Design a protein around this ligand. Sequence first.
Ligand SMILES: Cc1cc2nc3c(=O)[nH]c(=O)nc-3n(C[C@H](O)[C@H](O)[C@H](O)COP(=O)(O)OP(=O)(O)OC[C@H]3O[C@@H](n4cnc5c(N)ncnc54)[C@H](O)[C@@H]3O)c2cc1C
Ligand SMILES: Cc1cc2nc3c(=O)[nH]c(=O)nc-3n(C[C@H](O)[C@H](O)[C@H](O)COP(=O)(O)OP(=O)(O)OC[C@H]3O[C@@H](n4cnc5c(N)ncnc54)[C@H](O)[C@@H]3O)c2cc1C
Ligand code: NA
Ligand code: NA
Lengths: 126, 126
Amino acid sequence: ECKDEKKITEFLNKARTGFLGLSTNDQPYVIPLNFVWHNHAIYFHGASEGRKIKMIEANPEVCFTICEDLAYMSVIIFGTIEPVSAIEEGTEAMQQMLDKYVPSLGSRTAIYKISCRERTAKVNEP
Amino acid sequence: ECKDEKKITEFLNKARTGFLGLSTNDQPYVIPLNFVWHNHAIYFHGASEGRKIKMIEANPEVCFTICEDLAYMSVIIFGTIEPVSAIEEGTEAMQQMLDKYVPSLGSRTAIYKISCRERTAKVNEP
Ligand SMILES: Cc1cc2nc3c(=O)[nH]c(=O)nc-3n(C[C@H](O)[C@H](O)[C@H](O)COP(=O)(O)OP(=O)(O)OC[C@H]3O[C@@H](n4cnc5c(N)ncnc54)[C@H](O)[C@@H]3O)c2cc1C
Ligand SMILES: Cc1cc2nc3c(=O)[nH]c(=O)nc-3n(C[C@H](O)[C@H](O)[C@H](O)COP(=O)(O)OP(=O)(O)OC[C@H]3O[C@@H](n4cnc5c(N)ncnc54)[C@H](O)[C@@H]3O)c2cc1C
Ligand code: NA
Ligand code: NA
């Protein structure tokens, strides 16, 4: 039931893959995504078309769950998602990603931002 | 947009962690779980108390997403979840898990079963 803000941040900076949970009606949908943790927020680059985007336009309340090694730590982030229009925020977040992953989603894409309303972390046995 | 039933099965047998997506109202909740793929279904052992179980009793329509290495493969499973009362199905599934993970959730637990109504797989670049 962890609460060490530096450990979590380190984890959120290193973790490669996160799982975005959406729902319209009572029908959940969970997809893996590359992401960066920046500001007090999760950003990812994504095609601005698809099931994920229909659901978001319908219901921007989302969940983002990350879980990995360095016993297992898992973080869950609740908040609301929205596409980024701020050019510089958008550009920072993109550079932050290349730096993270590299130190076609093709036609029409955008940067998306989940504002961290609530966050919970846990360390787990097996 | 893969469709090789043997490759997927091999993947579902080996993958360590899955992500269970639930919703009540328009509020998603995603948690990581140990699991086995058996029958045409996902089973896991879990405490029969907690947020996960309140939501399930309210809305048994769920999503289960698995994503890992052996380029990246990701599988999404849609279906309905329910606790297992069948003693032998329950016992097979439990043995299947020990064999998978080992070849406190404490008080009150159960085996849960997501019946695979629909399944989709994908292989991904980065
Ligand atoms: C490790 C990894 C990293 C990824 N990183 C990113 C990224 O940063 N940005 C990004 O946009 N995408 C990323 N993806 C793919 C991401 O899941 C896509 O956005 C998603 O696959 C397509 O989204 P959609 O809802 O618009 O798809 P749609 O094409 O509209 O999906 C419709 C149907 O296709 C199936 N489906 C969709 N996605 C998947 C999936 N991933 N696996 C199995 N079935 C699926 C579902 O059954 C769904 O109902 C990554 C995937 C992996 C595995
Ligand atoms: C890799 C790994 C494997 C796991 N395998 C299993 C397993 O097979 N069976 C099992 O029951 N559990 C497993 N867990 C833990 C699983 O997530 C628990 O069921 C869950 O953590 C508690 O479920 P709940 O909704 O009843 O929790 P509750 O205690 O009722 O949760 C209430 C609040 O706690 C927070 N929270 C709950 N779970 C997590 C979490 N995992 N990470 C961060 N915050 C959380 C959320 O903010 C939530 O709103 C595993 C976890 C990890 C990381
Ligand atoms: Na993972
Ligand atoms: Na994973």
